[PDB]
Amino acid sequence: PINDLRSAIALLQRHPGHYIETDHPVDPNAELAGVYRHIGAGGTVKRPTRTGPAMMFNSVKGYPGSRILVGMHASRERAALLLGCVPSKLAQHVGQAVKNPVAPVVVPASQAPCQEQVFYADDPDFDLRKLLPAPTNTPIDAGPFFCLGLVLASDPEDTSLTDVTIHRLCVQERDELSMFLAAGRHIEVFRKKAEAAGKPLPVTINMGLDPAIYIGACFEAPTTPFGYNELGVAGALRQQPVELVQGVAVKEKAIARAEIIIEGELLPGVRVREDQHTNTGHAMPEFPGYCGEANPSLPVIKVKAVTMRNHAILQTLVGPGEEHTTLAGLPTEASIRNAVEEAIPGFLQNVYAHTAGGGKFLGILQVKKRQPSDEGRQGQAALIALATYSELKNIILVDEDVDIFDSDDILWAMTTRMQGDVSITTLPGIRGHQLDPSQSPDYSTSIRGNGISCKTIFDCTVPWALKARFERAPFMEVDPTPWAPELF
Amino acid sequence: PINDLRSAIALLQRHPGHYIETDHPVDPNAELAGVYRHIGAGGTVKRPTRTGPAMMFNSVKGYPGSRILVGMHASRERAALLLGCVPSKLAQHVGQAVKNPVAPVVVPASQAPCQEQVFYADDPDFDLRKLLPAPTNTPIDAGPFFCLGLVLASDPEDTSLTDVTIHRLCVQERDELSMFLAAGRHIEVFRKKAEAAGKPLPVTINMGLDPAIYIGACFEAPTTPFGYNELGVAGALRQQPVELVQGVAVKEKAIARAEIIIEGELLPGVRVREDQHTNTGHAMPEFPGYCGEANPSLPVIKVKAVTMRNHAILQTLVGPGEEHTTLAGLPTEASIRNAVEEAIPGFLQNVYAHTAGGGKFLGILQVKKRQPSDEGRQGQAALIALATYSELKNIILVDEDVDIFDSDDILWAMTTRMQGDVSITTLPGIRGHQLDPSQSPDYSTSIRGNGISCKTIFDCTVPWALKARFERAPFMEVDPTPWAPELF
Ligand SMILES: Cc1cc2c3c(c1C)C(C)(C)CC=[N+]3c1c([nH]c(=O)[nH]c1=O)N2C[C@H](O)[C@H](O)[C@H](O)COP(=O)(O)O
Ligand SMILES: Cc1cc2c3c(c1C)C(C)(C)CC=[N+]3c1c([nH]c(=O)[nH]c1=O)N2C[C@H](O)[C@H](O)[C@H](O)COP(=O)(O)O
Ligand SMILES: [Mn+2]
Ligand SMILES: [Mn+2]
Ligand code: NA
Ligand code: NA
């Protein structure tokens, strides 16, 4: 029974290979990320890299008694273990979750392990920078970062509407963090209403959570539109309302079973340059694998209190690599699968928000042509995917005999089941995503501005009429165990 | 020092994970290939499959005392070990060997372990089908097959011109094998000449060899033109001439340290249907991953003698999967690397004949743009690759910060470093390869006949002017070993 991060870790230890610890000292500045890069960062991280175990650094240089956990979500198999299904059915398992959310439930403070220790910021010696080791990913980061900070805010005019979102948080002062919100972010709608009335917006930052909470929170419109508490997707994954606690210093709720809580308020009118103390010009690595630039004008969170468990674990990520692939990719897959299943029932077999696209840019669709009229529906599925998730860039379509989670098998379909002048459709001038550096007028004359792209559909499905000629060579079905028992 | 198969096996046993044995009885008909499909076939083989150890089946049902080895070359890492270099530098290492061949030498029978046993076919009790297990790959194969039969033959007008090639051989009678020779093959030139004179062509079939010999043999023109004895490549790989021996019954040389040798003659005028005894309509699986159709008219080899070591190993393959990727792909890489380095010195960093194309259809070229004039040379390198290896189909160009052996990283370059209406060039109507089933007029109206293709170049290199914007997020250089010694 997984209710929080420690129970999640306990399960990983019953599956050797998914969790390791180290007592060898590590510097949270750059060096920690440098080590996990080789061990389990994965995703779009510059090679050498791999997926591996979730990793707990127990001796943090300069922070005795702290312990930093990274890579908890940095594997599709591990995410499947933590959620209780097989990795090939996460798209369907998460898909059914978002469409049957279970609302969270408030709990008294005596049942909130997060509040076992309280450090009020009005203490003269309080210093967030000495209190928690916020690691940096690269030596050219804007500063120390919290990268798995699940921020919880609400509409200041309608308390009933609450939104939770992961945002990168840069420690800027002893009691201040900057926070980046992209255009049209759902919490930004709350802050702008607060700022326009000259009022601060109370928020809580919740770190070190049940993996179910982080994963369920990363949906986007139109799948989870404005007004959809993303809490409850977690409630559907656990068949259990996540538990909330009333904040010890702000008029806002915090997740009771979290490891560390930061209570604060978004301040009206205030803006800071994200790299003001570093002047590196960069924020931190983005999910496509490149360095994001330092945001010149960010809102500020004024910390009112920090609240944490005894021997609190600081959970964050590195890369963001495969951890981002899982958090962003499984909502992506669930959204596409739900949409195609509504429009063409029974046709789509599976979908993979490929890690090469960070879980957002590259969609692999596995279809099954069952009848002559299914020819021509593979392109329709690609259109539905592009319509459902506008930040997609490319679609690869394959049949049910291609393993869409094996990139060699994907390239195989692109080699023997495609003709370049037949199977490739380009859609110029469609808005995509700012963080793809090839989406620039400097890359293509058909691109009118940053974050606009040509989008490409690679149809690697066998034409219906030719399917009898493209059967993969069949081998006798045997049980190989007796000839190699140790290999299982 | 490796000079035959068993010295190669001895090396693999010093690197655990690369060689296993089993004494559990196995049926060479279909069952053996079915087991190794799950264990080490890899490549384009129908999932589930993987690369693993080379595997020796010590108990062969119906052939007591026989033992069959498969998968010797079914791993790029295994191949680099057997050749004595790092897998990333195989293209350079094999490339230099083909440019500096070492000619084979003749030795007396006393130094030819292949001739420890001699079985003459004119014995009334001789039966090729009882003497050696010839495993099949699928239940629908044309018949028993030898899939690592390195055929050695010479020109009937000039016996100094020797060629050596792997051809698939189906056991048809107690003393006959059918042999498929594609059009334009070098040994086929010798065969057509002998048949035009109404005379047989003496051949030796050499099975169970130094991996350097099998790999070195799989070159094609123009890299190894007609007249180039490919045994010189193996000689350069070992810095030791391959040793030849006079056959016992045919006027042709045999590989002295081979495990099994079939001496025979290609009969003039005789033709046979490959599946005459099974009528399956199929031959065996082909490297693109589909089942080939039976050939209705093949020349036959009249077996004159079989010649073996004591406790001889019969070496063959399954899939052909990753074993074919290694055997065809390493010369493909070497051929391309030599051509590009001659034309554009210093530009090409590496090349991968991707396993998704069986080592023939898909070429990944890794280039490094060093100066503004290198812009536009990435497409030139693709043209050189296409001109050097006409059976290539598609080329993917990437920069030196992309791991060309990581298919995830390849798809990443295809996602963030590619614009569909900019980076994709199609070349319709270029002769490709018959065994790509999409190279058919039924797949594309620009294809005039079977084995003609559209060939496509995916330029996923960063445009020179934009290189400062496409730097991958830099993580601090650390030695990760002290934080997880067990995983290094
Ligand atoms: C998973 C994930 C999502 C990040 C993200 C990160 C991760 C790991 C970081 C921490 C590594 C770096 C940047 N993050 C930001 C981000 N969106 C944003 O506006 N600012 C961000 O700083 N996102 C994307 C955002 O969280 C998702 O798109 C949500 O679905 C948006 O939810 P919403 O529609 O309710 O606003
Ligand atoms: C590695 C390999 C190459 C095969 C091959 C196989 C393998 C494993 C088999 C055993 C799995 C089944 C088919 N094979 C044949 C073949 N060429 C051919 O003409 N007939 C064949 O049957 N080839 C290709 C041939 O070996 C290469 O193209 C040589 O480079 C041709 O050399 P050449 O120019 O000297 O004739
Ligand atoms: Mn939302
Ligand atoms: Mn030749
Ligand atoms: Na949200
Ligand atoms: Na040859």
Author numbering:
A (entry chain B), B (entry chain A): 4 to 491
What does the paper say about this structure?
Based on a literature survey and a preliminary activity screen of heterologously expressed potential para‐carboxylases, 3,4‐dihydroxybenzoic acid decarboxylases from Enterobacter cloacae (EcAroY) and Klebsiella pneumoniae (KpAroY, 89 % identical) were selected for further studies.2d, 13 Both enzymes belong to the UbiD family and are related to a ferulic acid decarboxylase (Fdc1), which has been shown to facilitate the (de)carboxylation of cinnamic acids in the presence of a recently discovered prenylated flavin (prFMN) cofactor. The AroY monomer consists of an N‐terminal prFMN‐binding domain (residues 1–339), an oligomerization domain (residues 340–475), and a C‐terminal α‐helix (residues 476–495). Crystal structures and in vitro reconstitution data unambiguously demonstrate that prFMN is employed as a cofactor, and that oxidative maturation is required for activity.
Upon in vitro reconstitution with reduced prFMN,14a, 15 decarboxylation activity could be detected with 3,4‐dihydroxybenzoic acid (3,4‐DHBA, 1) following brief exposure to oxygen to generate the active prFMNiminium form. The active site of AroY is clearly defined by the prenylated isoalloxazine moiety of the cofactor and the presence of key conserved residues. It is situated near the hinge point of the prFMN‐binding domain motion, and at the cleft between the oligomerization and the prFMN‐binding domains. Two water molecules are clearly defined in the active site; one of them forms hydrogen bonds to His327 and Lys363 while the other one interacts with Lys363, His436, and Arg188. We hypothesize that the two water molecules mimic the two hydroxy groups at the meta‐ and para‐positions of the substrate protocatechuic acid. Given the relative rigidity of the substrate, we superimposed a catechol moiety onto the two water molecules, and the carboxylate moiety was positioned in close proximity to the prFMN iminium group. In Fdc1, the substrate α‐carbon atom adjacent to the carboxyl group is located directly above the prFMN C1′ atom whereas in AroY, the α‐carbon atom is located above the isoalloxazine N5 atom. Owing to the preference of AroY for catechols over simple phenols, a second hydroxy group seems to be mandatory for ideal substrate positioning (with a hydrogen bond between OH and His327) in the active site of the enzyme. The carboxylate group, on the other hand, is bound near the conserved Glu‐Arg‐Glu/Asp triad of ionic residues, which is located near the prFMN N5=C1′ iminium moiety.
